[PDB]
Amino acid sequence: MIVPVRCFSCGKVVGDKWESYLNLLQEDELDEGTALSRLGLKRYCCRRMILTHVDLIEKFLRYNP
Amino acid sequence: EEGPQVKIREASKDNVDFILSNVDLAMANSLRRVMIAEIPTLAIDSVEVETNTTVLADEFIAHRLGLIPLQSMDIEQLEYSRDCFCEDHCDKCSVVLTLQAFGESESTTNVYSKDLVIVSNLMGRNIGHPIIQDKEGNGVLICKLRKGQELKLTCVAKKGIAKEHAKWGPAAAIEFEYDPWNKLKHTDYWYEQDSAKEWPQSKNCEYEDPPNEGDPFDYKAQADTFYMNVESVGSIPVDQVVVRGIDTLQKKVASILLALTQM
Amino acid sequence: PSLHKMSMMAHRVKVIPYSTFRLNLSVTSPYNADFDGDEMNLHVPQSEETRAELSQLCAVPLQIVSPQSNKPCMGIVQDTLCGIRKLTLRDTFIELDQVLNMLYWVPDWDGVIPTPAIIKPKPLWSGKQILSVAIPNGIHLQRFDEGTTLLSPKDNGMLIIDGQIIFGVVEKKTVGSSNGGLIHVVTREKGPQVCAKLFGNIQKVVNFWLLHNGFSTGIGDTIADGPTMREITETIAEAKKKVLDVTKEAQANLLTAKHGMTLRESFEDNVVRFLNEARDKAGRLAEVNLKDLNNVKQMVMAGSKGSFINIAQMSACVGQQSVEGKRIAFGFVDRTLPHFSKDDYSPESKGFVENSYLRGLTPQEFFFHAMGGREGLIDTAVKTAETGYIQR
Amino acid sequence: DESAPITAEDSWAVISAFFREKGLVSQQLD
Amino acid sequence: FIVEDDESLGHKELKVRKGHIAKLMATEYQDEYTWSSLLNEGLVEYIDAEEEESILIAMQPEDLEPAEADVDPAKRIRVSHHATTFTHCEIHPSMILGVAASIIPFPDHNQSPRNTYQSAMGKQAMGVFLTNYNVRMDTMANILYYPQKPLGTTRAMEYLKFRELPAGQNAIVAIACYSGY
Amino acid sequence: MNAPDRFELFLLGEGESKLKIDPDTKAPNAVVITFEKEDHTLGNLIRAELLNDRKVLFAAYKVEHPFFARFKLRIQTTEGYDPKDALKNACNSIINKLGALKTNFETEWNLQTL
Amino acid sequence: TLSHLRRTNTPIAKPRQLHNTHWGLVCPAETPEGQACGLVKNL
Amino acid sequence: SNTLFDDIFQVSEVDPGRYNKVCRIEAASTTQDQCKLTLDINVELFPVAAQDSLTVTIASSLTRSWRPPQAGDRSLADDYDYVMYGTAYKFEEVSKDLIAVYYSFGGLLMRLEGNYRNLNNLKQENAYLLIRR
Amino acid sequence: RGNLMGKRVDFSARTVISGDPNLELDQVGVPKSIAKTLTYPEVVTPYNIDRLTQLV
Amino acid sequence: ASRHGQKGTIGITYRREDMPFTAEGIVPDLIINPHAIPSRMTVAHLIECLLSKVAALSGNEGDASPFTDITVEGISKLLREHGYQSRGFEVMYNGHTGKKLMAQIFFGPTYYQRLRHMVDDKIHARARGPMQVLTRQPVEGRSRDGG
RNA sequence: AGGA
Ligand SMILES: Nc1ncnc2c1ncn2[C@@H]1O[C@H](COP(=O)(O)CP(=O)(O)OP(=O)(O)O)[C@@H](O)[C@H]1O
Ligand SMILES: [Mg+2]
Ligand SMILES: [Zn+2]
Ligand SMILES: [Zn+2]
């Protein structure tokens, strides 16, 4: 539910890296393991942040008030 | 040239690989700790909410705002509010940021680290600017709005350290390694058939000589030579996470001397 | 519950931050407490008279040796037990830097740095040597384990002369809540206050040493040799034949029923017995192939957690499943599941789990294990009530 | 090969169709 | 699944063929060949408890259909397709499990009660229970700030919406004796 | 809720002193220094440098409970040498070594082009 | 919520035990502990 | 205040039964036939192979705390390449003039058996063990 | 059995337990909040007069 | 709790500097005890971790389905391809000293659930307070401030 | 209806 700023484990800023990760997947037709790596996410702690995120905000946005 | 030596392997905007030689482990580690824990930064520490029509909670957003990295280049010429003589805060001890966003568009309206505006006086000092390392120049994505979804906040960023809260963390992970060939026997490898086969070789093996089997155990051998990598978040540049770490640790020691003097 | 004299003990207040009651780890056994979310009750006496009753009768140190079984009801447990073995091996030597911290940590240390067991090349102290700083001067303890020579070649048994370890590895037999135990002797010889202080000391040193040594456990510890796996696989195969042999024999009317048994009762006893013989044989193959570096073996060795049976089921083979002693019955007409032909008496049909947990279970194996497991959860639920009222 | 035998992996496509049609609370509703 | 002796080409073979499978997946990609379609073409059937007594089931299809005319040591030891009388086949043997057990990674590698346990704990967990949580006024409600889908999943979770609505976070974990805390 | 204030890790309390120096009774020419609002960062550092001083007979440190940011440091020196002096020196040695470290790093950092 | 809508209660000779007939109809592991164990079954 | 035993031995066997840094040595005296020796050794610090000449000495001296440096500054009572410190734990009477003494060096055990060193080897916690070559 | 053999009582507290290697065998970690609730009735005596006057 | 009947409470939280670390600069979020495994035979917990460790590096969803052809030896192969030691062990360094741990730690990501049992919602103390009417004894319940 |  909305991308976390900073990796829990190490603290690397991850808040910016979401919109791009989604583009590298759709626009660039890439696989997750590459997309993540192109965005610099090398340590598995950083990788799980972006990889295992579930952007629930998008559903909540679908309700009128 | 002097006492402990340094040899930078690779430098960048946000990562420094170097080899620390002629030191005690206890000192490389004390430096390791300081870089994580005790270098001061600037971070949002008070969020006053005027409007929120968002799907996110006032405090959920508040939490996020703290984690947004801010310019802490001139952090040394700012006071801790604790030390400052005002009722609450001021320009001597804080940076005041503002955030106003509304969904004018039919499409989802985004809220970014860039959307923050300094309303306080910066006394002509490099501080408070949200760190934008982003390709499209947006920084951290704080929120998302639909239509009449509004957001109104006033933020007071203050000087602080990681020991108080990790939002004042100037550095991300710090790589640290010594003795890639286990010549000191500071470890005992778990194996199935062969420890040498089953355990990967370090990249730092190249910067040290292999043990050579036909040699007795060097018990006299002490640990010096530390393969390290300091990674910055943005608040302070890589070199300064190293330098300010060294200075912070130095002051920390000097305080003990001064404490003994007053005694 | 509170089924014990020791399920209610008097303690010294220690006002601390955070919202939980904190208790010493050795006190965990008499209460039957663990920290998976257990809660406890505190009672404050309001009199000078009641306070005395508590300090003078129900104090934790007084409770150390228990009349229930005339032996200590508190001992060294978990981390401290696991690390006390590791610290005390012949192999284990400590350098000055750490030796000095290991010392300062004992709150009663005489301020006397003992002479190292090795004075050049390099001064080295042994685990034994520095653990002995916790053991008070006057404690004498002798123990002989399986084939302990007065030269203790295997580092077996225990020899403690005047609060100093001469030989033997310290573990569950010495430091645990055992009859001849270092603890039983410390209370009996020095006092309940001196013994209770010893708990703290052994744990402050051992814990510190282990903090810096480390200890872990992973899947690697369940993996057994390829040849040991071949050996186990063929061990089950021969047992399955031995079973089929008695199966063809009993179907050909050749079987001779045991006196006071059905012809069938006789056969099933034999089948069940070959399958169990095997589960142990194969299991015994694993515990031998595991090196002294096997973290599981290391916990089984100290006695901190685990036993042979766990190694057996995890690494080698789970075994025969039982519901009411009798192997999986025919719930369906003449078969255990619809994926079996009728009148099938084979180990696989009656619920023998040939596979190890490391290898994984088949759907039949899974469901049979499930039937068996559920039987336990029922008998705990049933008995837990019967047993409580017996006590009443 | 429109009538070639099914693979073990294929079973998921069958299961998939069962849920698409029935759902997880099928029995309550029916 | 229905298995028929009926086959011009060799043995007793499973009615559902590679063609039906892609024909279904055509309807999967659209978001005409439904579940009822299999049911009325008589490729699949509903077997109650009473009828189960009079049938013979295969666990795997391919793995338990064409007979023998090297072997991996790593895999668990499986039986055989000695039977020629097979009336039906098991769609998937993981479908023996209910909702709770279905979220357990590798349950066939755990001691049975440890699964009976976890099947009761996920009901005390926390996460997103419904997306309309902001519009509903329930007495007591717990929502996880940053839910994450598991790195280790079950093929059943697809149908359970677990990846869409999680209950946990992927913690970086060390199994270690550290401070003794 | 039973949670101490985060600043209680580094900010000295009401009438609390950084150092509390007491003489060890168990051994001659021995001292016990208590460091308030201090962790392992500075603990193990001082301890180790004291070990380098030839005239320092014993040096060890301990954090008695992790809830509290303080530590005890015990120093024992050769007769005639004061343990307070032992600490003064080991501290200066540390600063002077960090001095070289900063200098050498900056020197090296400058040489890079990135 | 899902597991609650797929729940079964057995009111009141050995019902608690996991029976062979339960294969594929009811979960082998989803049962509570205690007074309920084996009488509260899940589909 | 003096030395207690001195002789040269020859290694029969060296044994690391499960141990990685330690071995139990087996040696007989080159001089007296009646004399044999069993001893645990830190092979990492001082390795030993079979058929080695070793001068095994005991000595009471050269009892308060232990001082680390100033060893060059003081008299290094070692002309030996491996020194241990331990306790005497048993005095086994193995018939006639024959006696066996057991020494524990922090868990590293030793059994020396001879006959003549009667008026020397004392039941003392204080006994050093020196080895050269 | 409900009100005479057993009773609900005052001067009683209950919370989650956790282990501590830094506590002595005979002590118990009492959360501050709990200590600030549970009270002991001390008598004003010359030995304590000053101490008690301060806690008040 | 984990998804394997592995319940537990926090016993202490440590800051990043005090935590043990991989040379890569990685630090655990959680530290579970080696004793929680032998008696329990929760092998799947260990496999989950190893599988999820690969899944986080590869960026491909890790199938941990019940009846499948996935082997511990298979997953191990993949992890070694990623540069880590096959059985998920990693060398660690003590946070307080910086010194290498003599042991190698089974380090890797595992899914953990947050449970409804929180201390501050359970903690209770009473020392005189409401009494029932009939029995004139203390009332019942944390809510009602009972004894 | 849940907790050890
Ligand atoms: N219904 C009940 N009545 C009284 N006491 C109970 C109880 N249920 C559980 N307990 C207590 O809680 C303790 C722990 O039981 P569980 O929570 O199931 C873990 P365990 O069965 O001890 O195995 P483990 O230590 O290997 O994990 C028991 O030993 C018992 O004292
Ligand atoms: Mg419990
Ligand atoms: Zn990270
Ligand atoms: Zn101000």
What six digits make up the tokens of B115? 């959307």
Contact C243, C274 (CB under 8 A): yes
Name residue, tokens 């992996």.
D9
- Residue B231 sits at the vertex; the CA angle it makes with B228 and B233, to the nearest 5 degrees, is 165
Pocket test residue of C31, C34, C78, C380 for ligand 1, highest count of atoms within 8 A of CB = C34
CA of B41 from ligand 1 middle (Å) equals 48
Residue C99's CB is within 10 A of a number of other CB atoms, namely 20
- The pair of structure tokens assigned to C46 is 């309001």
Asked if C36 CB < 7 A from strand K, the reply is yes
Tokens for B194, please give them.
Answer: 């062969």
C-alpha C36 – ligand 1 centre gap (Å): 10
Q: Collapsing DSSP states into helix, strand and coil, what is residue G8?
A: strand
Q: Which ligand is nearest to the CA of A49?
A: 3
Answer whether E180 touches I (CB < 8 Å): yes
Q: Tell if G32 CB is < 7 Å from nucleic strand K.
A: yes
Query: Which experiment gave this structure?
Result: X-ray
Tokens 């042991």, located at residue: J103
Place of tokens 């030579």: B225
Kindly report the number of other CB atoms within 10 A of residue H48's CB atom.
18
C38 annotated to a ligand binding site = yes
| Residue C74 contacts residue C63 (beta carbons within 8 Å) | yes
Cβ pair A33:J57 closer than 8 A: yes
The label of the residue with tokens 């830097």 reads: C97
Ligand 1 residue neighbourhood (C-beta within 6 Å): C 1, 32, 36, 384; J 39-40
The closest alpha carbon to H56, from H103, H1, H15, H20, belongs to H103
Which of H65, H66, H74 to mutate to test binding with chain F, by most F CBs within 10 Å of its CB?
A: H65
CA I38 to chain centre: 5
* Physical contact, B and I (3 or more Cβ pairs within 8 A): no
Closest C1' nucleotide to J122's CA: K3
For residues B203 and B263, membership in a common domain is answered with yes
Nearest residue to B145 via CA among B177, B115, B179, B189: B115
Q: In CATH, what number is assigned to the domain containing residue C177?
A: 1.10.274.100
Cα torsion C284, C287, C290, C292 to 10°: value is -140
| Residue from C157, C156, C97, C94 nearest C131 by CA | C94
H40 pairs with which residues across the strands?
Answer: H24
Range of the domain at E25: 1-98
Q: Which chain C residues are within 8 Å of G18, Cβ to Cβ?
A: 367, 370-371, 374-375
CB E131 within 8 A of CB A56: yes
Domain that holds residue B3: 1-40+167-263
Decide: residue I35, CB within 10 A, 0-12 exposed, 13-18 middle, 19+ buried.
middle
C29: how many CB neighbours lie within 10 A of its CB? 16
Q: Is C249 in a helix, a strand, or coil?
A: helix
CB pairs under 8 A between F and I: 7
User: How many Å does it take to go from CA B57 to C1' K1?
Assistant: 30
Cβ-Cβ contacts under 8 Å for I36 (sequence gap 6 or more): none
Q: How far is CA C151 from the centre of its chain?
A: 28
Same domain, B139 and B215: no
Architecture of domain H1-133: Beta Barrel (2.40)
Q: Which residue has the tokens 């086969």?
A: B197
C121: left (phi over 0), alpha (psi -120 to 50) or beta: beta
Of C332, C366, C378, the CB nearest to G16: C378
Annotated binding residue at A45? yes
B192 to C293: CB separation less than 8 angstroms, yes or no: no
J72, J103, J123 ranked by CB distance to C358: nearest: J72
Is the Cβ–Cβ distance between B179 and B227 less than 8 Å? no
Domain F1-114 has CATH 3.30.1360.10: yes
Tell which CATH architecture fits domain A1-65: Orthogonal Bundle (1.10)
- For the stretch J81-99, what's the b/e string if a residue is b when 16 or more beta carbons lie within 10 angstroms of its beta carbon? eeebbbbbbbbbbbbbbbb
Task: Quote the minimal CA–CA distance from B233 to chain A in Å.
Answer: 6
Q: Do B60 and E134 touch (CB under 8 A)?
A: no
**End-of-domain residue from the set B166, B185, B214:** B166
Segments making up each domain of chain H, as ranges: 1-133
Q: Quote the number of domains for chain B.
A: 2
Distance C199 CA to K4 C1' (A): 26
Which residues 6+ apart lie within 8 Å of B208 measured at CB? B179, B180, B181, B183, B225
Nucleotide with smallest C1' distance to residue E121 CA: K2
- Domain check: are B138 and B51 in the same one? yes
d(CA A15, CA C132): 55
Amino acid identity, position C264: R
- Answer yes or no: do B172 and B244 share one domain: yes
Q: Cα separation of H86 and H127, whole Å?
A: 6
Q: How far is CA C146 from CA B85, C69, C89, C143, E105, in A?
A: 76, 25, 17, 10, 43
Count the Cβ atoms, other than its own, within 10 Å of residue B61: 20
Give yes or no: residues B63 and B118 share one domain: yes
Amino acid B185 CA to nucleotide K2 C1' distance, rounded Å:
52
Asked whether the beta carbons of B159 and J7 are under 8 A apart, the reply is no
| Inter-axis angle of helices B25-37 and F83-110, nearest 10 | 70
8 A C-beta contact, residue E31 and residue D19: no
Q: Measured between CB atoms, which of J127, J135, J137 is closest to I37?
A: J127
Return the residue of I nearest to C32 by Cα.
I17
E121 contact to strand K (CB, 7 A limit): yes
Distance CA(D17)–CA(E39), nearest Å, equals: 11
- The reply to whether the CB atom of residue J124 sits less than 7 A from any atom in nucleic acid chain K is no
Q: Give dist(CA G19, CA C369) in Å, integer.
A: 12
The set of chains that have 3 or more CB pairs under 8 A with E is: A, B, C, D, G, I, J
Strand C65-66 and strand H22-29: the pairing is unpaired
Q: Which H or E run contains C142?
A: strand C141-143
DSSP states of E3-67: EES--SSSS-EES-BHHHHHHHHHHHHT----HHHHHHTTSS----HHHHTT--EESSSGGGSSP
Q: How far is the CA of J57 from the centre of ligand 1 (A)?
A: 39
Residues B144 and B178 in one domain: no
Q: What is the 8-class DSSP label of residue C205?
A: H
**Which of D6, D7, D17 faces E35 most closely, judged by CB atoms?**
D17
Please name the amino acid found at residue E112. S
Last residue of a domain, one of B133, B166, B199: B166
Question: Which domain covers residue C102, as residue numbers?
Answer: 78-213
Q: Could you tell me which chain B residue has the CA closest to the CA of J85? A: B199
* Long-range residue pairs from H14-22, CB within 8 A, at least 24 positions apart, any chain: H14/H43, H14/H48, H14/H49, H14/H50, H16/H43, H17/C153, H17/C154, H18/C292, H19/C89, H19/C90, H19/C91, H20/B188, H20/C91, H21/C91, H21/C93, H22/C90, H22/C91, H22/H108
Q: Are residues B157 and B47 in the same domain?
A: yes
